[PDB]
Structures are given as C-alpha cells and as structure tokens.
Design a protein around this ligand. Structure first.
Ligand code: HEM
Ligand SMILES: O=C(COc1ccc(OC(F)(F)F)cc1)N[C@@H](Cc1ccccc1)C(=O)O
Length: 454
C-alpha cells in the first residue's frame, strides 16, 4: 500500500485555492504532469483522488466496484438540470426509467431519422460561410455553437433557435449560459456566503425560473396541439419504460430537455472547434480529410450512408477528442471498500475524479508522440485498449448522445472540408476557455470557397 502525493496547500483551505483560476481543468492537468497517475485533492469538508493513468482508470471503470458520482460541478448543474439523465444518481428511479425510454431515441439506427434535420442546419452554416465577403473571417467556436444548438433544438423539440439569423442569444440560452457560469464559478469560492455573491445567487434563482417557465411552456404547447413530430419530445411524451411501465412525468421531461440543450450548446461545438484547429495546424492531415470529403460527398445534400463512409473524418474527430475531450472529467464513488491498483485502499463512498485529457496522454498506451495530432492512431479500432479512450465516459452512465454527436460532427466537418479551403490567417495561439466544457476561445480562420453548389 502506497501514500499518494498531494499538490500545494493553503492552510485551512487545503487545495481549494488551486481552483481559483478561469482554467481549473488545465491547472489539474499540470498538477497530474508533476505528480503522476494519482493525487489527493482536499477542500474543506471534501476529499477526492484525481486519476490520470489507464492502469488506475481501467479499475475505476469497473461498474461492479464503482458507480457514477456527482462532482461538485454536477451537483451545482443539478440545481437546473434536476434528475435529468446527466445529473441523476444511478439509484434514482428517474435515471433507469429515462435511460430505458431514451436509449432507442439515441441509437445509431435513430440517426437515420435525425439526419435530414442535421443537414438543414449544416447547410445553413455552409451558406453563411459562402456569403462572407473577401475581407471577413469566421469565428469558429461561435459558429459551431450556433450549429450545434440549432441541431439539438430541431432534433430535441422541433424548435428553430435560428442562431444563424441573430447576434444576441435566445432568452433561454442567456439564462442557461449564465447558470452554467454560476455553477462552474461557485465550486472555486473560498467563502461562498460572502455578500459579493448575493447578486450572483439572486440571478441564478431568476435563471432557473426562466429555463423552467420556457421549457414547461414548450411541453404544455406540444401536449395542447397533439402534434406528433419525430423529435425527442414526442418520444418522451409517448414512450413507456418497459420495466416500470411508466412514461416520464412533465417535470422530468423538462429536465431532460434542459439537459440536451446544455449538451448541444457545450460539447459537440467544442469538438468541431478543436477538430478545425488541429486541421489548420496539421496541413497533411487536412489534405487527407479534405480528399475523403471530396470523394465521398458526391451529392449537394449528404446522405446518411455517405456520412458513415467518412472514416478518416471520424479518425480526425477521435484524435481531437483524445487531445481535448471537451467534457474533460467524470467522477466515481467506491460501492464498497476496495483497493485501487493493489496500492491505494479506498473506503465505501470514497470519490475518484477521472482526468480524461491526462488518460489520453498516457505514454504507456499511446507512445512517446502523445502531443502530436495523428488521426492514424485510430486507423485500427481493435488496437485501442479497453478504457484507454474515454471521451464519452463509462459504462451504463456513458454519454447517451455519443452517436448523435459523432453523426452531426462527421456530417458538418465533411461538408466544411468539401466546400472550403481554410487558412489560419492569424497563426492562432490555442487558448482554451472552460465553461462546463473546453472550447478554443478566439479561434478564427478564413475560408476560401471551392465554389461547389449546394
Ligand atoms: C462530443 C460531444 C459530447 C461529449 C464529449 C459528451 C461527453 C459526455 C460524457 C463524458 C458524459 C459522462 C458524464 C459523467 O460520467 O459524469 C456524458 C453524459 C451524457 N451526455 Fe454527453 N457528450 C457529448 C454530446 C452529447 C449530446 C449531443 C447529448 C444529448 C443531446 C448528450 C447527452 C448526454 C447525457 C444525457 C448524458 C448522461 C447519460 C446518463 O448518465 O444516463 N451528450 N456526455
Ligand atoms: O475536477 C473537476 C473538473 O471540473 C469538471 C467536472 C465535470 C465536468 O462535467 C463534464 F465533464 F461533463 F463536462 C466539467 C468540469 N471538478 C471537481 C472540482 C473540485 C471542487 C471542489 C473540491 C474538489 C474538486 C468537482 O467539480 O468536484
């Protein structure tokens, strides 16, 4: 049995001031580089252990030994995402019920149904870029977030956010972004009761009311009309859990909708942003990806079958998820006393944090070149060890949106590479903003149209 290292302390605040930074995940990554595969992290009233090696993470991913934990980030997001799938405990009735009802909505087979809606928004992105003047550039995370919010609005509840028509966000989205900001800033506060945060707390309750009022009105307007659009909302109003035989109640459906809107706004847009970043920084890779896009997407409207043929585009997306998994951590608790790694005794209830960006840099798995962007690592899916690559979390609590996200990202990146050449005209220095997720702030490019009709 071994004693684990611990980063520098601040007296009675223990390690908590290490999170007083706009880039706490990047700070924890640097601490893992200094300390190794495991370190203890303490705050007043709390202890966790940060894991970075595939050796320890493969054990943490054993569902017989560990279940999903709500990290302080997720407990704070739970104040507006409720017992939706992302912020429920595995043992809460609504977790398994919603999981069983929603799984078929999110299958690879269901993607054939969403494809046409995804294409609608992707074509809006391509037309936006085709219509820029010579002197203009693209704001990449801004445009990718317009796309992914619109896609989940249309697939989620047949609602057009029309993000490509506006500068200012939808009222729901201003409240959702401000609530995500509160939840993520609050876990850093050395003195959460400071009157300096009274206004933040007032605003947070206001933002919860806005999200609830607006989503509850979407649900009630849909129940009033009777309309049967092929969207997640229809599936949730109609679907029955085989186990309980019950449908979701209207409060839980509201939490699921809020949850899908957080996911679409925060995650897939980060992935696309990082992927285009690595492509403009790696022109050999961009050429191989653009060759596949040109050869496969032979029609002005991509088909479902064509998007499945974009093998290398998919490899690019996986390599971007390796280096910068946009949802960069997940948390576990020990179901019972257990020894991790033959070395670290844990008691029932003990928490672990999985630092996904560090897992994905384990040289014992990936080799010495871990910082290089090389989609060829993913040529042969067989060759990636179990629990080596975990950008969608683990087991029954893995991302239900994984197929949706990869379908949208493969479609959109393929269309981008078909329709334009890209220039890193500013020699962009990567600057990773942390919200719920990671995104490359201030990333801009110029696109030169290949002048291929839609
Ligand atoms: C590249 C895009 C995305 C990434 C990287 C991502 C990542 C993740 C990860 C890491 C988790 C596990 C969290 C944990 O263990 O605490 C998760 C859970 C989840 N994700 Fe995603 N996600 C993505 C896109 C989406 C989309 C598009 C949806 C839905 C519209 C979605 C819905 C969910 C839900 C509902 C859960 C909770 C599942 C459950 O516990 O039953 N995600 N995601
Ligand atoms: O380590 C992290 C990283 O933050 C994120 C956790 C989840 C997360 O959600 C997602 F990965 F899904 F995006 C995003 C960021 N969070 C920890 C930070 C912490 C706070 C107080 C005491 C000890 C540790 C946590 O939220 O518990």
């Amino acid at each position: 049995i071994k004693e684990m290292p611990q980063p520098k302390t601040f007296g009675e605040l223990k390690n908590l001031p290490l999170l007083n930074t706009d880039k706490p995940v990047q700070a924890l990554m640097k601490i893992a580089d200094e300390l190794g595969e495991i370190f203890k992290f303490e705050a007043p009233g709390r202890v966790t252990r940060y894991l970075s090696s595939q050796r320890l993470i493969k054990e943490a991913c054993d569902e017989s030994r560990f279940d999903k934990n709500l990290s302080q980030a997720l407990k704070f997001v739970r104040d507006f995402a409720g017992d939706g799938l992302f912020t429920s405990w595995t043992h809460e009735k609504n977790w398994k019920k919603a999981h069983n009802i929603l799984l078929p909505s999110f299958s690879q087979q269901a993607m054939k149904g969403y494809h046409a809606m995804m294409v609608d928004i992707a074509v809006q992105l391509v037309q936006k870029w085709e219509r820029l003047n010579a002197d203009e550039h693209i704001e990449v995370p801004e445009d990718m977030t317009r796309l992914t919010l619109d896609t989940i609005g249309l697939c989620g509840f047949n609602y057009r956010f029309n993000s490509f028509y506006r500068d200012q966000p939808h009222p729901f989205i201003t409240s959702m972004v401000r609530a995500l900001d509160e939840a993520m800033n609050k876990l850093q506060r050395a003195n959460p009761d400071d009157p300096a945060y009274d206004e933040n707390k007032r605003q947070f309750q206001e933002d919860i009311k806005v999200m609830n009022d607006l989503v509850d009105k979407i649900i009630a307007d849909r129940k009033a009309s009777g309309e049967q659009s092929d969207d997640l909302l229809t599936h949730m109003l109609n679907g029955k859990d085989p186990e309980t035989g019950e449908p979701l109640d209207d409060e839980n459906i509201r939490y699921q909708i809020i949850t899908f809107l957080i996911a679409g706004h925060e995650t897939t847009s980060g992935l696309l942003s990082f992927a285009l970043y690595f492509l403009v920084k790696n022109p050999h890779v961009l050429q191989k990806a653009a060759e596949e896009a040109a050869r496969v997407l032979v029609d002005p409207v991509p088909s479902y079958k064509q998007v499945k043929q974009l093998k290398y585009v998919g490899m690019v997306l996986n390599e971007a998820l390796r280096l910068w998994p946009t949802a960069p951590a997940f948390s576990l608790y020990a179901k019972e006393d257990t020894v991790l790694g033959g070395e670290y005794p844990l008691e029932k209830g003990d928490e672990l944090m999985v630092l996904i960006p560090q897992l994905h840099r384990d040289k014992t798995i990936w080799g010495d070149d871990v910082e290089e962007f090389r989609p060829e690592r993913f040529e042969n899916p067989s060759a990636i060890p179990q629990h080596a690559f975990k950008p969608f979390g683990n087991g029954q609590r893995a991302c239900i949106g994984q197929q949706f996200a990869l379908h949208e990202a493969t479609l959109v990146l393929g269309m981008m590479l078909k329709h334009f050449d890209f220039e890193d005209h500013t020699n962009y220095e990567l600057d990773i903003k942390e919200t719920l997720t990671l995104k490359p702030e201030g990333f801009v490019v110029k696109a030169k149209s290949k002048k291929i009709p839609l």
